[PDB]
Each structure stands twice: as structure tokens, then as C-alpha cells.
CSV table of C-alpha atoms and ligand atoms in Angstrom, one decimal:
chain,number,residue,atom,x,y,z
S,1,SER,CA,102.4,109.0,93.1
S,2,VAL,CA,103.4,106.8,96.0
S,3,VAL,CA,104.3,104.3,93.2
S,4,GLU,CA,106.8,106.6,91.6
S,5,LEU,CA,108.2,107.7,95.0
S,6,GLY,CA,108.8,104.0,95.7
S,7,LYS,CA,110.6,103.5,92.4
S,8,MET,CA,112.9,106.4,93.2
S,9,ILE,CA,113.7,105.1,96.7
S,10,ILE,CA,114.5,101.7,95.2
S,11,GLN,CA,116.8,103.1,92.6
S,12,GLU,CA,118.6,105.5,94.9
S,13,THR,CA,119.0,103.6,98.2
S,14,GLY,CA,118.8,99.9,97.0
S,15,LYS,CA,116.3,99.5,99.8
S,16,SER,CA,112.7,98.7,99.2
S,17,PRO,CA,110.5,101.5,100.7
S,18,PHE,CA,108.7,98.9,102.8
S,19,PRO,CA,109.8,98.0,105.4
S,20,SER,CA,113.0,100.1,105.4
S,21,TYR,CA,111.4,103.6,105.2
S,22,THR,CA,107.7,103.2,105.6
S,23,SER,CA,107.8,103.8,109.3
S,24,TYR,CA,111.4,105.0,109.9
S,25,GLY,CA,111.9,107.3,112.9
S,26,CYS,CA,109.5,110.2,113.6
S,27,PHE,CA,108.8,111.3,110.1
S,28,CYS,CA,109.3,108.7,107.4
S,29,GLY,CA,106.0,107.3,106.3
S,30,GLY,CA,104.1,109.8,108.5
S,31,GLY,CA,104.4,111.9,111.6
S,32,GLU,CA,104.3,115.6,112.5
S,33,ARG,CA,106.1,115.7,115.8
S,34,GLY,CA,109.8,115.5,116.4
S,35,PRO,CA,112.5,116.2,116.9
S,36,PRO,CA,113.8,114.1,113.9
S,37,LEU,CA,116.0,111.3,115.1
S,38,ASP,CA,118.8,111.6,112.4
S,39,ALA,CA,119.7,112.7,108.9
S,40,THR,CA,117.5,110.1,107.3
S,41,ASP,CA,114.6,111.2,109.5
S,42,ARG,CA,115.3,114.8,108.5
S,43,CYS,CA,115.1,113.8,104.9
S,44,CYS,CA,111.5,112.7,105.5
S,45,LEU,CA,110.7,115.8,107.5
S,46,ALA,CA,111.8,117.8,104.5
S,47,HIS,CA,109.7,115.7,102.2
S,48,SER,CA,106.5,116.2,104.3
S,49,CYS,CA,107.2,120.0,104.2
S,50,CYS,CA,107.7,119.8,100.4
S,51,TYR,CA,104.3,118.1,100.1
S,52,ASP,CA,102.9,121.0,102.1
S,53,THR,CA,103.7,123.3,99.2
S,54,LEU,CA,101.4,121.3,97.0
S,55,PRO,CA,97.9,122.1,98.3
S,56,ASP,CA,96.6,122.3,94.8
S,57,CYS,CA,97.8,118.8,94.0
S,58,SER,CA,97.3,115.2,95.1
S,59,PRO,CA,100.9,114.1,95.7
S,60,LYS,CA,100.0,110.6,96.9
S,61,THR,CA,98.0,109.7,93.8
S,62,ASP,CA,99.0,111.9,90.8
S,63,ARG,CA,101.0,109.7,88.4
S,64,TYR,CA,104.1,111.0,86.6
S,65,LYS,CA,107.1,109.8,84.6
S,66,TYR,CA,110.8,110.6,85.1
S,67,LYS,CA,114.0,109.9,83.4
S,68,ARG,CA,117.6,109.4,84.6
S,69,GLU,CA,120.1,111.7,82.9
S,70,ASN,CA,123.8,111.1,83.8
S,71,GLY,CA,122.8,109.4,87.0
S,72,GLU,CA,120.4,112.2,88.0
S,73,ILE,CA,116.6,112.1,88.2
S,74,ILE,CA,115.0,114.3,85.6
S,75,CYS,CA,111.4,115.3,86.3
S,76,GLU,CA,108.7,115.5,83.6
S,77,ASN,CA,106.5,118.6,82.9
S,78,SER,CA,103.2,117.4,81.5
S,79,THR,CA,101.5,119.3,84.3
S,80,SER,CA,102.6,121.7,87.0
S,81,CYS,CA,101.5,119.3,89.7
S,82,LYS,CA,103.4,116.3,88.3
S,83,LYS,CA,106.6,118.5,88.0
S,84,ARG,CA,106.4,119.7,91.6
S,85,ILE,CA,105.4,116.3,93.1
S,86,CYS,CA,108.3,114.7,91.2
S,87,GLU,CA,110.8,117.3,92.5
S,88,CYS,CA,109.7,116.7,96.1
S,89,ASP,CA,110.1,112.9,95.6
S,90,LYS,CA,113.4,113.4,93.8
S,91,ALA,CA,114.7,115.4,96.7
S,92,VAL,CA,113.8,112.8,99.4
S,93,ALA,CA,115.1,109.9,97.4
S,94,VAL,CA,118.5,111.5,96.9
S,95,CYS,CA,118.6,112.7,100.6
S,96,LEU,CA,117.9,109.1,101.8
S,97,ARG,CA,120.8,107.8,99.6
S,98,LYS,CA,123.3,110.4,100.9
S,99,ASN,CA,122.6,109.4,104.5
S,100,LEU,CA,122.7,105.6,104.1
S,101,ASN,CA,126.0,105.5,106.1
S,102,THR,CA,124.0,106.5,109.2
S,103,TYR,CA,120.8,104.5,108.5
S,104,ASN,CA,119.8,103.1,111.9
S,105,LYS,CA,117.9,99.7,112.0
S,106,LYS,CA,116.7,100.5,115.5
S,107,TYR,CA,114.7,103.4,114.0
S,108,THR,CA,113.1,101.3,111.2
S,109,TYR,CA,110.1,100.6,113.4
S,110,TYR,CA,110.3,103.6,115.8
S,111,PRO,CA,107.2,103.7,118.0
S,112,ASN,CA,105.6,107.0,117.2
S,113,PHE,CA,104.5,107.6,120.7
S,114,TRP,CA,108.2,108.3,121.4
S,115,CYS,CA,108.0,111.5,119.2
S,116,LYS,CA,106.9,114.1,121.8
S,117,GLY,CA,108.0,117.5,120.5
S,118,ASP,CA,105.7,120.2,119.1
S,119,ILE,CA,104.9,120.4,115.4
S,120,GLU,CA,107.8,122.6,114.3
S,121,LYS,CA,107.1,125.0,111.4
S,122,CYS,CA,108.9,124.0,108.2
C,1,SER,CA,93.1,105.8,96.2
C,2,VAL,CA,95.0,105.5,99.4
C,3,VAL,CA,93.2,108.7,100.1
C,4,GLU,CA,89.7,107.2,99.9
C,5,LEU,CA,90.9,104.1,101.9
C,6,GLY,CA,92.1,106.4,104.7
C,7,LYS,CA,88.8,108.3,104.8
C,8,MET,CA,86.9,105.0,105.2
C,9,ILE,CA,89.2,103.9,108.0
C,10,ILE,CA,88.5,107.0,109.9
C,11,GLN,CA,84.8,106.8,109.3
C,12,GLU,CA,84.6,103.1,110.4
C,13,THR,CA,87.2,102.8,113.2
C,14,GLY,CA,87.3,106.4,114.4
C,15,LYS,CA,91.1,106.2,114.0
C,16,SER,CA,93.3,107.8,111.2
C,17,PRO,CA,95.3,105.2,109.3
C,18,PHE,CA,98.6,106.6,110.6
C,19,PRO,CA,99.9,105.5,113.1
C,20,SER,CA,97.2,103.0,114.2
C,21,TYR,CA,97.1,100.8,111.0
C,22,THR,CA,100.0,102.0,108.8
C,23,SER,CA,102.3,99.2,110.1
C,24,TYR,CA,100.2,97.1,112.4
C,25,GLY,CA,101.3,93.4,112.7
C,26,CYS,CA,102.6,91.3,109.8
C,27,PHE,CA,100.2,92.7,107.1
C,28,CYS,CA,98.8,96.1,107.8
C,29,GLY,CA,100.6,98.7,105.7
C,30,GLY,CA,102.5,95.9,104.0
C,31,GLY,CA,104.0,92.5,104.5
C,32,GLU,CA,104.0,89.0,103.1
C,33,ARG,CA,105.3,86.6,105.7
C,34,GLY,CA,102.9,85.6,108.4
C,35,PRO,CA,101.1,84.1,110.1
C,36,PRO,CA,98.8,87.1,110.8
C,37,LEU,CA,98.9,88.1,114.4
C,38,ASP,CA,95.2,88.6,115.1
C,39,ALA,CA,91.8,89.5,113.6
C,40,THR,CA,92.9,93.0,112.7
C,41,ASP,CA,96.0,91.7,111.0
C,42,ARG,CA,93.9,89.1,109.1
C,43,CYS,CA,91.7,92.0,107.9
C,44,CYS,CA,94.8,93.5,106.3
C,45,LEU,CA,95.9,90.3,104.7
C,46,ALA,CA,92.5,89.8,103.2
C,47,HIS,CA,92.7,93.4,101.9
C,48,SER,CA,96.0,92.7,100.3
C,49,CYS,CA,94.5,89.6,98.8
C,50,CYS,CA,91.6,91.6,97.5
C,51,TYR,CA,93.9,94.0,95.7
C,52,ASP,CA,95.5,91.0,94.0
C,53,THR,CA,92.1,90.4,92.3
C,54,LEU,CA,92.5,93.8,90.6
C,55,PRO,CA,95.6,93.4,88.4
C,56,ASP,CA,93.9,95.4,85.7
C,57,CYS,CA,93.7,98.4,88.1
C,58,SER,CA,95.9,100.6,90.3
C,59,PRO,CA,94.3,100.3,93.7
C,60,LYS,CA,96.8,102.7,95.4
C,61,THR,CA,96.4,105.6,93.1
C,62,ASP,CA,93.1,105.3,91.3
C,63,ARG,CA,90.7,107.8,92.8
C,64,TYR,CA,87.0,106.9,93.3
C,65,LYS,CA,83.8,108.2,94.9
C,66,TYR,CA,81.5,106.6,97.5
C,67,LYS,CA,78.6,107.5,99.7
C,68,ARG,CA,77.2,106.4,103.1
C,69,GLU,CA,73.6,105.3,102.9
C,70,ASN,CA,72.0,104.2,106.2
C,71,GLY,CA,75.4,104.1,107.8
C,72,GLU,CA,76.6,101.8,105.0
C,73,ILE,CA,79.3,102.4,102.4
C,74,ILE,CA,77.9,102.6,98.9
C,75,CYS,CA,80.5,102.2,96.2
C,76,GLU,CA,80.3,104.0,92.9
C,77,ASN,CA,80.4,102.3,89.4
C,78,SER,CA,81.8,104.8,86.9
C,79,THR,CA,84.4,102.2,86.0
C,80,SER,CA,84.8,98.6,87.0
C,81,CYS,CA,88.1,99.4,88.7
C,82,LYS,CA,86.7,102.2,90.8
C,83,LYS,CA,83.9,99.8,91.8
C,84,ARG,CA,86.1,96.8,92.6
C,85,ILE,CA,88.8,98.9,94.4
C,86,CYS,CA,86.1,100.6,96.5
C,87,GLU,CA,84.6,97.2,97.5
C,88,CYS,CA,88.1,96.1,98.8
C,89,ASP,CA,88.5,99.2,100.8
C,90,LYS,CA,85.0,99.1,102.1
C,91,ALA,CA,85.6,95.5,103.2
C,92,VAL,CA,88.8,96.2,105.1
C,93,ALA,CA,87.4,99.4,106.8
C,94,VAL,CA,84.4,97.4,108.1
C,95,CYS,CA,86.6,94.5,109.2
C,96,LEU,CA,88.8,96.8,111.2
C,97,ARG,CA,85.8,98.2,112.9
C,98,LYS,CA,84.4,94.7,113.7
C,99,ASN,CA,87.7,93.9,115.4
C,100,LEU,CA,88.4,97.2,117.2
C,101,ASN,CA,87.9,95.6,120.6
C,102,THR,CA,90.9,93.3,120.2
C,103,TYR,CA,93.3,95.8,118.7
C,104,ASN,CA,96.7,95.3,120.4
C,105,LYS,CA,98.8,98.4,120.9
C,106,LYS,CA,101.9,96.2,121.1
C,107,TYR,CA,101.5,95.2,117.4
C,108,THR,CA,101.1,98.8,116.2
C,109,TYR,CA,104.8,99.0,115.3
C,110,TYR,CA,105.6,95.3,114.8
C,111,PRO,CA,109.1,94.8,113.4
C,112,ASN,CA,108.6,93.0,110.1
C,113,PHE,CA,111.6,90.7,110.5
C,114,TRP,CA,109.6,89.0,113.3
C,115,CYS,CA,107.2,87.7,110.7
C,116,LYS,CA,109.0,84.5,109.7
C,117,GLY,CA,106.2,82.3,108.4
C,118,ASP,CA,105.8,81.3,104.8
C,119,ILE,CA,104.1,83.5,102.3
C,120,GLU,CA,100.7,81.7,102.1
C,121,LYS,CA,98.7,81.9,99.0
C,122,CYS,CA,95.5,84.0,99.2
U,201,DAO,C1,103.7,105.2,104.4
U,201,DAO,C2,103.8,104.7,102.9
U,201,DAO,C3,104.5,105.8,102.2
U,201,DAO,C4,105.8,105.0,101.7
U,201,DAO,C5,106.6,106.1,100.9
U,201,DAO,C6,108.1,105.9,101.2
U,201,DAO,C7,108.5,106.9,102.4
U,201,DAO,C8,108.9,108.3,102.1
U,201,DAO,C9,109.1,109.0,103.4
U,201,DAO,C10,108.8,110.5,103.3
U,201,DAO,C11,108.0,110.8,104.6
U,201,DAO,C12,106.8,111.6,104.2
U,201,DAO,O1,106.6,112.7,103.4
U,201,DAO,O2,105.9,111.1,104.8
U,202,DAO,C1,101.2,102.2,104.3
U,202,DAO,C2,100.3,103.3,103.9
U,202,DAO,C3,98.9,102.7,103.8
U,202,DAO,C4,98.1,103.4,104.8
U,202,DAO,C5,96.7,102.8,104.6
U,202,DAO,C6,96.3,102.2,105.9
U,202,DAO,C7,96.5,100.6,105.8
U,202,DAO,C8,95.4,99.8,105.2
U,202,DAO,C9,95.6,98.4,105.7
U,202,DAO,C10,95.5,97.4,104.6
U,202,DAO,C11,96.8,96.7,104.6
U,202,DAO,C12,97.3,96.5,103.2
U,202,DAO,O1,96.7,96.1,102.1
U,202,DAO,O2,98.5,96.8,103.2
């Protein structure tokens, strides 16, 4: 559902996922080692962790629909997976928005070999 | 289908898509303005162009199956989309392998705002 995750990011941050968040910091768009550089990076870390709770699902490819109710994302429930994938995506999109005031352009293309820490448990 | 694409990449280049190809140059992992930086980057532009030949499909989320006969990728044919999407991924994975020897670590995290050329037609 990378497509739906992208639509959420667009609506919430006003930024297009690529290139603003596809390789941001140590965790946005991938990465297991930190520490996270900032709040935005922590949002992505939390998203990776959320996807870890979906071993029975295919988060990157399972399509789903969502609505906006009073400015809030409302997840569908056609299947258990779609619901949980959607909630994970909803969380990250809102988190990215809330920390726009600290978005750092010098982290947009952060070289991943700068992320040295261990893989910290979620 | 990004899942299948990633598997092919690993099988062909011995590298996982992230971080080696997820944001390489002006076109790998996304991008429109060029010109492409090198052979590897041109592989990604051609891949993007290939996906543009599948407007009736969803190349990033449509799952498909494939085999490896005699070291070669053998795409399935259950649906036309699964077949055509698989041939695009097969093509880019093989191209990345063919150009492994000129992969440039300094383009792995290329800042996209450095790609200032026009958006050439495919
Ligand atoms: C790398 C392409 C994926 C683009 C999706 C937008 C980024 C969301 C960031 C969440 C980080 C994560 O769970 O990897
Ligand atoms: C950005 C997540 C995509 C990860 C897959 C590895 C990149 C494949 C390269 C093809 C470039 C393209 O069509 O964007």
C-alpha cells in the first residue's frame, strides 16, 4: 500500500513523499540502525516498528481505502490486514505533519553509512 | 510488486535494493530530471519508462510469480500485467548486474535537486 501511504503523506505534509521523505535521515524510506536524527526520523522509526507488527500482512502491497472525517484519517475494515496497515500509515503521516517545523533539508538525503548505532528494539 | 523487484535485485546484483539502489543518482528510486549520471542510472530511467508502458497495471503493488531457469529469470503469465510488470523488473535487475562494475558510491545518496536537466521523453 505504498500508494496509499504516499497519498496520506501528501495530504498531511503537503510534501511529496519523493524526494522529501523517501531517504530522510536514518529511518525514513528504510534503515534499521540509528540513533534517529530528529522527530521526523523518529516518526519513521515508529512506522518501521508498526510494520513489524504485521508479519501476517503485506504492508507494502496490500491496497486499502480511507476517508477523512473532520480532518482526521478514518481507516477502512474490509480485512484485518488493511485496517492495521492503514493505521500504521495514518500514524506516520500525522507524525510527519506534527514535526514539519523541524524538518531538516540536510537530512533529506542523509548517507546511511552515517547511521552507526545498533538495531534498537522497538 | 516492489517485493518481487527487490528479490530480483538481490538475486542479480547480490545487493539489497536499500540502500544501494533506493536513491541512486537521478532516477533510481525515483526522479524525472536528468541527465542520468551513469549506466546504472540509465538502467533505472529505462525501468521507469518501462513502467510507463503499463498504465493498465499497478507495477508497484501487483504481486507476481517468477522462476530462474538456467540462471535466467522466467516470468509468469497468469495475467498480462503480471507478465509485463515482471519483464520490466527482470530487465532492470539484469541491467544493474551488467553495470555493477561502474557503480559509484558517491551517487548512492545523490541529492535530487542536483538533477537540473529537462524531463526527457522516454
Ligand atoms: C522508500 C519508498 C517508500 C516511500 C514511502 C514514504 C516514506 C515513509 C517513511 C516510513 C519509513 C519506513 O517505515 O520505512
Ligand atoms: C524507492 C523504493 C523502490 C526500491 C526498489 C529499488 C529501485 C529500483 C530501481 C528502479 C528505479 C525506478 O523505476 O524508480
